[PDB]
């Protein structure tokens, strides 16, 4: 009642896009545990790398990496179908317990990060400040990756849709497609939202 144990910065995992998904939000009174179900990005993806991070930025790259672990043995499946649950657990001691478990095959890996781990009080204030200094440039990244990821989804949707009607697709339609798809993917590697939405439009 007089003082409270709180997480100084948010804790989460890096996801598709180079972004960072927060599982334990900033200033949560630590004895807390949160779990969110994620999946794979690619078809027949056999393992996922759980990259633990601490920070407030949108780029997983602009945060503190607390550790990383792999959860493999994911039985081949269409991308977006395997179920992987990541669970962030911080006890009163402030020790972080990050586990991942294939909600089907039963497999589960674990990593335990001690409370001395992370950005010190100094780094914590700089993190918080840069978060604010860059808040908008960060917003640019958010809208960028959402679109980028959606361009990824189209590249595949389309690519597979070709098979679903291979010969049904007359040459200079089917050829007109294979071409732009090449174009979009290159754009996705880029970071121009305007350009990506364009190559998306082209397809």
């Amino acid at each position: 009642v007089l003082l409270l144990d709180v997480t100084p910065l948010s804790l989460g995992i890096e996801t598709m896009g180079g972004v960072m998904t927060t599982l334990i939000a900033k200033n949560t009174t630590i004895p807390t545990k949160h779990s969110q179900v994620f999946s794979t990005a690619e078809d027949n993806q056999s393992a996922v790398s759980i990259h633990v991070l601490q920070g407030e930025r949108k780029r997983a790259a602009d945060n503190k990496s607390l550790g990383q672990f792999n959860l493999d043995g994911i039985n081949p499946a269409p991308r977006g179908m395997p179920q992987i649950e990541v669970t962030f657990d911080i006890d009163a001691d402030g020790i972080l317990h990050v586990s991942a478990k294939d909600k089907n095959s039963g497999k589960e890996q674990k990593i335990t990060i001690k409370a001395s781990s992370g950005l010190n009080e100094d780094e914590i204030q700089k993190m918080v400040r840069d978060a604010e200094a860059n808040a908008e440039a960060d917003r640019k990244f958010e809208e960028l990756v959402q679109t980028r990821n959606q361009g990824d989804h189209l590249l595949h949707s389309t690519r597979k849709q070709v098979e679903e009607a291979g010969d049904k697709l007359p040459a200079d339609d089917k050829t007109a497609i294979e071409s732009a798809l090449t174009a979009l993917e290159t754009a996705l590697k880029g970071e121009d939202k305007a350009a990506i939405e364009a190559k998306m439009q082209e397809l």
Binding site: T15, F38, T40, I50, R79, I84
Partner: peptide, 4 residues
């Protein structure tokens, strides 16, 4: 939220 997809993982690589």
């Amino acid at each position: 939220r997809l993982l690589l």
